[PDB]
C-alpha cells in the first residue's frame, strides 16, 4: 500500500502481533470508515531511511527506539506532542526512550527485555550462572538433549554477556570517540561465548528458527528470548517458565533494553489521524489486549493495563531482567556499533579471527553521504524549479510542484527569504553570468571556485541562502545556452545537492536541521 490521504499504512516487524493490530484496524474502520493496512516488510528498518528520504514509506513505523535517533536527525520523523492527560497514562521512562534533543519523536508501546526461558521438565530448576552451563550440557547430551540454544546471528542476543563484565558501546554527552567494545570485560565475555562453541556446547550456525524449534520440540532445555516468543511456546504444550538470565563473573547479564515504539513519517499527510488512532484505539485496554493475544508485547507502557499484566510471573521476570540492563541509546551511531559488533561476533564465533583482532576491528569501525544528498535535492529541486518557471523555461521533470509534507513548509520559507536577498541586489545578479563567462569546459571549476570562496571565512544560514541563489541562477543560465542543455540543469542541481551533503551537512545539523531553518527565518 502507498501513502494516501484518508488511509493509514503501518510497518511492523514480522515477529510482533500484526494480526491482532490488524483487528484493531478493522474496528477503527467500522467505527470511523477509515481503512488501516498493516504490513511487515523484510529489513524495514534499513528501507525506511532510504524511501523516507524521497517522500515514500509508511505513515507509521514500528521498531525499537535505538533506530529512531538516526532517523530524526535526518529529518524523517514528525515531532509528537500529546495532552497531559494522555502522557500521564503511560510510564515516564518509556517517553524518555523516544526523546531526541528535547523532542518526543514516537509513541512508546511496550518494554522489551530478553529473559531465560526453560523447560521445567528437563531443567526443573534453572542455572543461576553462565559458567555452570558447560557442565549442564554434557549432562544433557548424555540423554540426547542440549542445555541451551539461542540465536547467535544477531548481536542483540549475545550482548548481555559481552556487557556483563564491562562491555559498553558509548561512554556517557555521549563520546563518539570512546566506544569500549575492545576493553577487557568485552574480550572476557566474547571469549566465554566462543569457548562454548569451540567446546561443542553450541553451534556457531544457530539462529532464531533453529533455537525455537529445538526448545518447542523439547530438544534443548533452555533458550534466551523476548515476550513475542511466548505464544508459540504455549501452542507446543511445553511445560516452561520465564526467569532471570544467568550471571557472568558474579555480575548480571546486562541486556540492551528496547521500547517498541510507533513513529510517524515526516512525509505522512495523515499525522493527526495517525495520532488519534494510536491514542484512542491502540493505547487502550481493549486495543493492547487485541495485539497481546496475537503475540505477547511484554510490559506495556499503558498503566491501566500493565497493572493487570504485572501479576503474570512472566512479566515480573521481564521487568527484573530489564532493570539489570541498560535502556539502549537512540543516537545515530547505534547503527554502526551494531554492524561492527555483528561482524566481530560472527567472525570470532566461526573462527576466522581471534577475539583480540575482531573486537579491535569493532573498535575502529564503531567510530565514523548519498542519502543526505537525496534529502537536500528535494529542497534544491523545488527552488530551482520555481526559478525556472519564473524565467519562462520549460524543462523536463521540472514541471509542476507536488511537494510532500516536510518540504512544503521549507520550500515556502526558502522562497520568502531568497527573494529578500536578490531583491536587494537585482543588478549584481542579473549580470552575474556575463562576468564569469562559463563554458562547458570551465563550468565545473568556476562553480566550485566561487562556492569555496563564499564559505572560506565561515558559515551561517544567510551564506547558505546566498549559495542556493547563486547555484539556482547558475543553473538557469546553463539551461539558456544551446551548448549546455536540459542536461546541465539536473547536473547543476546535483552539484548543489552534493556540495551541501559534502561540505555543509555538519553545520546544518549542528544548528538544528531544517526545523532550525524554519525557526530562524520564522515570520511576525
Amino acid at each position: 500500500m502507498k501513502i494516501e490521504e484518508g488511509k493509514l499504512v503501518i510497518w511492523i516487524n514480522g515477529d510482533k502481533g500484526y494480526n491482532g493490530l490488524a483487528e484493531v484496524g478493522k474496528k477503527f474502520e467500522k467505527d470511523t470508515g477509515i481503512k488501516v493496512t498493516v504490513e511487515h516488510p523484510d529489513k524495514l528498518e534499513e528501507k525506511f531511511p532510504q524511501v523516507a528520504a524521497t517522500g515514500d514509506g509508511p505513515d507509521i513505523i514500528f521498531w525499537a527506539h535505538d533506530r529512531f535517533g538516526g532517523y530524526a536527525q535526518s529529518g524523517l520523523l514528525a515531532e509528537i506532542t500529546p495532552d497531559k492527560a494522555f502522557q500521564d497514562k503511560l510510564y515516564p521512562f518509556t517517553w524518555d526512550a523516544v526523546r531526541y534533543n528535547g523532542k518526543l519523536i514516537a509513541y512508546p508501546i511496550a518494554v522489551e527485555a530478553l529473559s531465560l526461558i526453560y523447560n521445567k521438565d528437563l531443567l526443573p530448576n534453572p542455572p543461576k550462572t553462565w559458567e555452570e552451563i558447560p557442565a549442564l550440557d554434557k549432562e544433557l547430551k548424555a540423554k540426547g538433549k542440549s542445555a541451551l540454544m539461542f540465536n547467535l546471528q544477531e548481536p542483540y542476543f549475545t550482548w548481555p554477556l559481552i556487557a556483563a563484565d564491562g562491555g559498553y558501546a558509548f561512554k556517557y554527552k555521549y563520546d563518539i570517540k570512546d566506544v569500549g567494545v575492545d576493553n577487557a570485560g568485552a574480550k572476557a565475555g566474547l571469549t566465554f561465548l566462543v569457548d562454548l562453541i569451540k567446546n561443542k556446547h553450541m553451534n556457531a550456525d544457530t539462529d532464531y528458527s533453529i533455537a525455537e524449534a529445538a526448545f518447542n520440540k523439547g530438544e534443548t532445555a533452555m533458550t534466551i528470548n523476548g515476550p513475542w516468543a511466548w505464544s508459540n511456546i504455549d501452542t507446543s504444550k511445553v511445560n516452561y517458565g520465564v526467569t532471570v538470565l544467568p550471571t557472568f563473573k558474579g555480575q548480571p547479564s546486562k541486556p540492551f533494553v528496547g521500547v517498541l515504539s510507533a513513529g510517524i513519517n515526516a512525509a505522512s499527510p495523515n499525522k493527526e489521524l495517525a495520532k488519534e488512532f494510536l491514542e484512542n484505539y491502540l493505547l487502550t485496554d481493549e486495543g493492547l489486549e487485541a495485539v497481546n493475544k496475537d503475540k505477547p508485547l511484554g510490559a506495556v507502557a499503558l498503566k491501566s493495563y500493565e497493572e493487570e499484566l504485572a501479576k503474570d510471573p512472566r512479566i515480573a521476570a521481564t521487568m527484573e531482567n530489564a532493570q539489570k540492563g541498560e535502556i539502549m541509546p537512540n543516537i545515530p551511531q547505534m547503527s554502526a556499533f551494531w554492524y561492527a559488533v555483528r561482524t566481530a561476533v560472527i567472525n570470532a564465533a566461526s573462527g576466522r579471527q581471534t577475539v583480540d583482532e575482531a573486537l579491535k576491528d569493532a573498535q575502529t569501525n564503531s567510530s565514523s553521504p548519498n542519502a543526505q544528498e537525496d534529502n537536500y535535492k528535494r529542497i534544491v529541486k523545488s527552488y530551482v524549479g520555481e526559478k525556472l518557471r519564473k524565467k519562462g523555461l520549460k524543462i523536463r521533470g521540472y514541471e509542476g510542484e507536488e511537494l510532500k509534507p516536510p518540504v512544503i513548509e521549507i520550500a515556502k520559507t526558502l522562497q520568502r527569504v531568497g527573494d529578500e536577498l536578490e531583491s536587494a541586489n537585482t543588478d549584481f545578479f542579473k549580470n552575474m553570468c556575463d562576468q564569469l563567462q562559463i563554458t562547458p569546459s570551465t563550468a565545473y571549476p568556476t562553480f566550485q571556485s566561487i562556492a569555496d570562496e563564499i564559505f572560506v571565512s565561515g558559515k551561517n544560514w544567510g551564506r547558505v541562502v546566498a549559495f542556493l541563489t547563486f547555484g539556482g541562477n547558475f543553473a538557469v543560465h546553463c539551461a539558456l545556452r544551446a551548448d549546455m542543455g536540459e542536461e546541465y540543469v539536473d547536473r547543476v542541481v546535483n552539484w548543489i545537492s552534493k556540495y551541501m551533503a559534502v561540505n555543509l551537512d555538519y553545520w546544518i545539523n549542528q544548528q538544528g536541521g531544517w526545523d532550525g531553518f524554519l525557526i530562524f527565518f520564522e515570520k511576525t
Partner: peptide
Amino acid sequence: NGTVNKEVAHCLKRIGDDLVNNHQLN
C-alpha cells in the same frame, strides 16, 4: 580570468551576511 570569480564570491558573502543580520531576532 578567475579573479572575477573571487570578486563575485566576495559579493555573495557580504550579501548573505546582510540577510542573517536582518533576521537575528524574532
